[PDB]
C-alpha cells in the first residue's frame, strides 16, 4: 500500500495518486509564445487523475526574468496554451498554470524598452547572484523602480485578468507564484521590503501586496481554482526574512481568512522546503508549523524522493508532494514510482537552453 497512490479530491478535482508535477521554468516558450514542443512535454508527463503545474508564465510584458517563458496575456498566447491544454485532458490529467511575475529578478534585456525592473524596492539583488542572459552569458541585476500603490493595483489587475485568460485557455485553475524572491517575496521578505507607505514595515502591511493578489484572482475565477506558493525560509534572490516562521504563519493566517470570507477553499498551499537552492530539523519543523496552520491541502515541495514523498504522506505531513528534477528527466515519474524502477539523471545544462527536444522531450520512457 504506497500512500502516494491513493486518491485525493483537491477540492472539485479528483485526483488518482498524489505525485505532482512542480512548476518549472525550461525556456522553449520561444517569443514568449507556448509551443507545440511544451505539448509534447506535458503530455508526456500527464497521467489520468495526476496534477500538473506548468512553468511560471508571464502576466504581464513587465514580468519577465528568463529567456523565451510564455506569458498567458495576449489573446495569441492563450490560443496556443489552449492546444496544449486540450493534449494534458486527453490523457485525463488537471492542469493548473501558474502565473509569475519576477520583480526585481530580471534585466534590462527582458523588459520593454530596456527600462528598469520594477519591485517594492529601489535594492537590487546583490552581486552574489548573477542573471542568465538570452546568450547563455550571465549578467548583472541591475537597481528596479519601487513602485507605488497605484501602479501595484495595476499589477494585481494582471494577476486577475491572466487568470481569466488562464480559464479561457481550458486550465483547471492558477498557482499564484508567491515565493522565492520574485515580485510578491519582495513584498513579504523584510530582508527586502523597505517601505513606508501601507505596504511595508509591519508583517500585516507586507502581507497585503500577497492577500490582495490571491484576492483578486480568488473574486474572478473562485477559490477552489486557486493555488498559493511560497517560500518563507529560502536561500534564493537575496530573499530572507528576519523570523520566516512568523511570516508563513501571516501568510497562512490570511489565506485562511480569505477562504473564511469566500465561503470556499482554495485549491492549496504550496510550500517550498527550505533545503532547496537552485538544520535538517527546524526545516521539517518549519514545513509542519505552516501544514498544521493550514485550513486546507498542502502540497510540499524541494528536494523530495520516493521515499521522502512516502514518507511525507504517510506521517500526515502533506496531502500531495511535487517533484521538478525528476521529473524532467524522468517522464512517466509516477509509473516509476509506482512500480519502485529505476530513475534516470537529469542534465542541468539543458534545464534553460531552447531546444523543443534535447533535454526536454528526449528522455526516455522506462
Ligand atoms: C529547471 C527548474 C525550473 C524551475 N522553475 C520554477 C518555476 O518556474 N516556478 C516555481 O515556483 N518553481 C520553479 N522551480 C522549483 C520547482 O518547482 C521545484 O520546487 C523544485 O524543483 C523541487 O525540488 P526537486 O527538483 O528536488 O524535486 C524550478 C526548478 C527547476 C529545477
Ligand atoms: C530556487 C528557488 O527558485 C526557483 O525554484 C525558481 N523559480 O521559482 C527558478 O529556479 C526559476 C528558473
Known amino acids: 500500500?504506497?500512500?502516494?497512490?491513493?486518491?485525493?479530491?483537491?477540492?472539485?478535482?479528483?485526483?488518482?495518486?498524489?505525485?505532482?508535477?512542480?512548476?518549472?521554468?525550461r525556456c522553449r516558450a520561444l517569443n514568449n509564445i507556448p509551443q507545440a514542443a511544451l505539448g509534447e512535454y506535458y503530455e508526456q508527463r500527464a497521467t489520468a487523475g495526476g496534477f500538473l503545474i506548468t512553468e511560471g508564465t508571464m502576466i504581464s510584458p513587465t514580468s519577465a526574468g528568463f529567456p523565451?517563458?510564455?506569458g498567458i496575456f495576449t489573446k495569441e498566447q492563450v490560443r496556443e496554451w489552449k492546444k496544449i491544454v486540450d493534449v494534458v485532458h486527453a490523457k485525463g490529467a488537471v492542469i493548473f498554470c501558474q502565473l509569475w511575475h519576477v520583480g526585481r529578478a530580471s534585466h534590462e534585456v527582458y523588459q520593454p524598452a530596456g527600462a528598469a525592473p520594477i519591485s517594492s524596492?529601489?535594492?537590487?539583488?546583490?552581486?552574489?547572484?548573477?542573471?542568465?542572459?538570452?546568450?547563455?552569458?550571465?549578467?548583472?541585476?541591475?537597481?528596479?523602480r519601487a513602485i507605488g500603490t497605484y501602479e501595484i493595483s495595476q499589477v494585481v489587475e494582471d494577476y486577475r485578468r491572466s487568470a481569466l485568460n488562464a480559464i479561457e485557455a481550458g486550465f483547471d485553475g492558477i498557482e499564484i507564484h508567491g515565493a522565492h524572491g520574485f515580485l510578491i517575496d519582495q513584498f513579504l521578505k523584510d530582508g527586502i521590503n523597505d517601505r513606508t507607505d501601507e505596504y511595508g514595515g509591519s508583517l500585516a502591511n507586507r502581507c497585503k501586496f500577497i492577500t490582495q493578489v490571491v484576492q483578486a484572482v480568488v473574486s474572478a475565477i473562485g477559490a477552489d481554482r486557486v493555488g498559493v506558493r511560497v517560500s518563507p525560509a529560502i536561500d534564493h534572490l537575496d530573499a530572507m526574512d528576519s523570523n520566516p516562521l512568523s511570516?508563513?504563519?501571516?501568510?497562512?493566517?490570511?489565506?485562511?481568512?480569505?477562504?473564511?470570507?469566500?465561503?470556499?477553499?482554495?485549491?492549496?498551499?504550496?510550500?517550498?522546503?527550505?533545503?532547496?537552492?537552485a538544520s535538517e530539523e527546524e526545516e521539517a519543523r518549519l514545513m509542519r508549523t505552516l501544514r498544521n496552520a493550514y485550513q486546507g491541502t498542502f502540497i510540499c515541495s524541494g528536494g523530495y524522493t520516493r521515499e521522502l514523498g512516502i514518507e511525507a504522506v504517510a506521517q500526515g505531513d502533506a496531502d500531495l508532494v511535487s517533484y521538478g528534477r525528476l521529473f524532467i528527466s524522468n517522464p512517466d515519474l509516477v509509473m516509476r514510482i509506482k512500480l519502485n524502477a529505476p530513475l534516470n539523471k537529469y542534465n542541468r545544462?539543458?534545464?534553460?537552453?531552447?531546444?523543443?527536444?534535447?533535454?526536454?522531450?528526449?528522455?526516455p520512457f522506462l
Open 121 to 144: 524596492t529601489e535594492k537590487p539583488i546583490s552581486n552574489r547572484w548573477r542573471i542568465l542572459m538570452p546568450d547563455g552569458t550571465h549578467g548583472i541585476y541591475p537597481k528596479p
Open 1 to 25: 500500500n504506497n500512500p502516494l497512490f491513493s486518491p485525493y479530491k483537491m477540492g472539485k478535482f479528483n485526483l488518482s495518486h498524489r505525485v505532482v508535477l512542480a512548476p518549472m521554468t
Open 349 to 363: 545544462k539543458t534545464f534553460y537552453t531552447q531546444d523543443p527536444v534535447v533535454g526536454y522531450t528526449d528522455y
Open 247 to 277: 511570516l508563513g504563519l501571516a501568510v497562512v493566517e490570511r489565506l485562511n481568512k480569505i477562504q473564511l470570507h469566500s465561503g470556499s477553499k482554495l485549491a492549496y498551499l504550496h510550500v517550498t522546503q527550505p533545503r532547496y537552492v
Open 68 to 70: 523565451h517563458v510564455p
